[PDB]
Amino acid sequence: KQPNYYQDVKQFHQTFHHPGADQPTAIPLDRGVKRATWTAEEAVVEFLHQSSQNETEFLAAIETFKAGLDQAVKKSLKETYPVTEVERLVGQGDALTDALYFIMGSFVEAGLEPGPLFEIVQQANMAKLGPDGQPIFRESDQKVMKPDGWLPPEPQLEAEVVRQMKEKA
Amino acid sequence: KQPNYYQDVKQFHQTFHHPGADQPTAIPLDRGVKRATWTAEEAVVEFLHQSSQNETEFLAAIETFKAGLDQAVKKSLKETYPVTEVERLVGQGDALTDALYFIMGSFVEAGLEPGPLFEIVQQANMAKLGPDGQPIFRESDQKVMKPDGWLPPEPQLEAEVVRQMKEKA
């Protein structure tokens, strides 16, 4: 039933040449900034836009978010910084686990089971291999590109939501 | 081996009287803002602070994050808003699934298996029941309070990181 989330993303990383550590290793700060940004693009911006009915709502929600973000930074500025690489790894792991917990709570509040949705995203991601079985990388920024004939996940994700609505009716 | 993440948080929500939907239901915007904020407090602020060695690093990372956040909002402002409740649910589910995927990728980049860490957080959360088997709620803000004798997760989470480092050595 439940997907092996970590092994599935680990697999995506190997297949498409994203970073992966075989031994626990603190994530370098410049790389962490990227990951934090990508995560929030989805968990904050897309989530809030898709929760909004107009520009006025959406902007008020973003500003409220920004104020909470700023309060959290101000609180963190008063806390001492890690002094070893192990300390940085431990604090990252702690933060990533709570973040995972909150994401999961948002699924609970939405009444959506995440496993089948994650499975759709995983399969579509893996289907980005070209017809030679190799990833397609664009010369600008090495972005992984979609091959000709690739079926996008969005409509299936939507059909999965409707399926769950029907199951729980 | 792998925890049932969704069922474990669903359980935490029932036990401690947080919201939960039995049928798939779009999350109201004011509630989504809260969840987005809590998620980013961990995935962005705590994660970046624990990735930093000093105030100068940390502030540069936060500003870089904010610039990416602002670019994403500007892009989203040009996209049409959902016009039904089902549309809002579908877009939230989509966003929450990608966010989950990125969190998982951060575990991959750190080389940390999330399951055992999540298990420690889950168990500590569940152990917040008082000695009558009931949650303790503070009159200010109904915050769930820790009972006398509660063992905090942080040191165990750290010991778990060291255990994984040892296993992968």
Author numbering:
A (entry chain A), B (entry chain A): 2 to 170
Q: What does the literature reporting this entry say, word for word?
A:
The α-helical NTP pyrophos­phatases share a highly conserved four-helix bundle, one face of which forms the active site, while the other participates in oligomer assembly. Nucleoside triphosphate pyrophosphatases (or pyrophospho­hydrolases; NTPases) perform the important function of hydrolyzing the α–β phosphodiester bond of nucleoside triphosphates (NTPs) and are often involved in removing noncanonical nucleotide triphos­phates to prevent their incorporation into DNA or RNA. dUTP pyrophosphatase (dUTPase; EC 3.6.1.23) catalyzes the hydrolysis of dUTP to dUMP and pyrophosphate. Here, we report the crystal structure of NTPase YP_001813558.1 from the extremophile Exiguobacterium sibiricum 255-15 (PF09934, DUF2166), which was originally isolated from the Siberian permafrost.
The crystal structure of a putative NTPase, YP_001813558.1 from Exiguo­bacterium sibiricum 255-15 (PF09934, DUF2166) was determined to 1.78 Å resolution. However, in YP_001813558.1, an unexpected intertwined swapping of two of the helices that compose the conserved helix bundle results in a ‘linked dimer’ that has not previously been observed for this family. The structure reveals an interesting variant of the all-α-helical NTP pyrophosphatase fold family that contains an unusual intertwined swapping of helical segments, resulting in an obligatory dimer that cannot dissociate without unfolding of the monomers. This novel ‘linked dimer’ defines a new subfamily of the α-helical NTP pyrophosphatase fold and is distinct from other previously observed domain-swapped dimers. Size-exclusion chromatography combined with static light scattering confirmed that the dimer is the major oligomeric state in solution. A surface area of 5104 Å2 per monomer is buried upon dimer formation. Divalent cations, preferably magnesium, are essential for NTPase activity. Interestingly, although the YP_001813558.1 active site assembles quite differently from those of the other NTPases, the putative metal-binding sites in all three proteins are absolutely conserved, except for a one-residue offset of Asp95 in YP_001813558.1. Furthermore, the active-site residues that are involved in sugar binding of the NTPs are also conserved when compared with other α-helical NTPases, but those that recognize the nucleotide bases are not conserved, suggesting a different substrate specificity. The corresponding residues in YP_001813558.1 are Val10, His14 and His19; His14 N∊2 is hydrogen bonded to the O2 atom of a 1,2-ethanediol molecule in the ligand-binding site. The corresponding pyrophosphate-recognition loop in YP_001813558.1 is located between H5 and H6.
